[PDB]
Amino acid sequence: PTVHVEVHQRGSSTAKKEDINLSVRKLLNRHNIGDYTWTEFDEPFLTRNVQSVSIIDDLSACTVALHIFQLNEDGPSSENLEEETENIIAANHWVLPAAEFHGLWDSLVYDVEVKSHLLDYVMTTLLFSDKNVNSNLITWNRVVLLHGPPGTGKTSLCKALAQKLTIRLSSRYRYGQLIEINSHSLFSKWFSESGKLVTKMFQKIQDLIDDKDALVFVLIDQVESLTAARNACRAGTEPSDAIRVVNAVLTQIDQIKRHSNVVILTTSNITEKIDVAFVDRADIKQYIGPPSAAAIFKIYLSCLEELMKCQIIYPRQQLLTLRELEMIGFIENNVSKLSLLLNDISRKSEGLSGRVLRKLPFLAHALYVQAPTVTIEGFLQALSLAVDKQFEERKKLA
């Protein structure tokens, strides 16, 4: 009965772990009765010290493992290039849980638990890892290769994964770090120095690696920038540069293998020219596709909810995930027809990108709402016309 639990610790509070532990357990045990978002408090302690306590995948007697995270505040931690070229953004160094990415885990929807797969990846990782398994016999690479066509959330998923792993591993990591590998930065003008300082970068990595209190999160967006090609024409024109620095990056992955705390996140909207080196160092190798119908549905629901919370649609209303829609047998009544036409919106919406999707509601509120206030029953067909436009647009896009 594993039930992981979130505890948002303020950067403005003063409470500590035991106080908050007792307090939150008292809150639950007071209620102790799907998933809920405990945000309206009765106890003054957490009212002053905690901003959000929710759980995301009806009963009580499950292993309620609380987990306390303090969403920090700093966004950038400038670590410029060691060599030269002042004010060149070498490292974007992201403190752990800091609120940039709060609640962003609710982005994706791929109900095959692809998320959960990637999630408990690192959990099982550390389980095997620090329980005396022989590397020499069984070993992996703490690369993680998300994989899928663009407009899907790959980099976003990387980030959210890091955040959630954070909230989980408080028991074993008081904190950790994310590392925005500015790939295009990594190279150098010169003949050699490029690889030479690839080392330096991975050394800044090793810095964090030493911190057993922390947990390392390499984030190499668009690794092809690192690894151009072993398969081009002989005119590569920077071969002794390109391929060289590439296999250097290979060496660095291969050294960082042996540790037990690092994880490398890697994606490509552009898998075409991926260089066999990574794919053969063969992380989870998680393929992704565009969102599913039900996915579009859930995401539209979330959109509507954020909207009604910011009053942009004034008469706040009720929604129904496909669960209750399917239980009511899709009976055509006034209440249902809202979400039923919504489902139709989705069923014609599939074939598009979640990026464009979460673009839709707002940009439609611009396009066909044409009013500072609007309600559902026209907002919906409005979104419909918007999506029709989107398809005809990609068509005309030639």
Binding site: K189, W190, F191, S192, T237, E238, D241
Partner: protein, 204 residues
Amino acid sequence: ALQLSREQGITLRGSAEIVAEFFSFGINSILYQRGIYPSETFTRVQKYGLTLLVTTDLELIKYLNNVVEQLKDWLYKCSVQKLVVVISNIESGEVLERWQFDIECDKTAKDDSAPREKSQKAIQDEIRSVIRQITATVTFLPLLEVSCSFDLLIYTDKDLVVPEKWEESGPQFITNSEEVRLRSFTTTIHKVNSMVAYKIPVND
């Protein structure tokens, strides 16, 4: 797709060369601006990636060329340590202006055969700093209500290596003169501090 740093290095004697022409052009410009000599009779050249005042006084031309090479020498032996240009009145000859340049050299240049990391870029721009600075300095030097002349003082610690025509002389202070310092500049071998002394005004 590549490039390469090719750093040349520096020498005792190269430092001497460059700082010699430094003082050449600087003296030219100083004696141009304040009115010490006929300004109209001069012109400009391109040096230090900038524009410089150059004379035509064949007399002073040859004179200062002699001085330049002799200083090149004494730098190549770290011999001199002060370089001053004392400007004074014509007849009563009272000192009005005294540009003191205090010189540091590299004794270890005897063994310092291997070069030192410092660029023509760096040295050049720093002398440009010097030049532009001195130029600016005219903006407050109390103007010369008369015409003037000048004399050239240095200080080589050695009373030893003295060539023929040069004679020993006196310190030539000023009674009521303010001294104001300019930016420093060096070669990692030779540095030269700079500061002008000038007769304090009678009336405010």
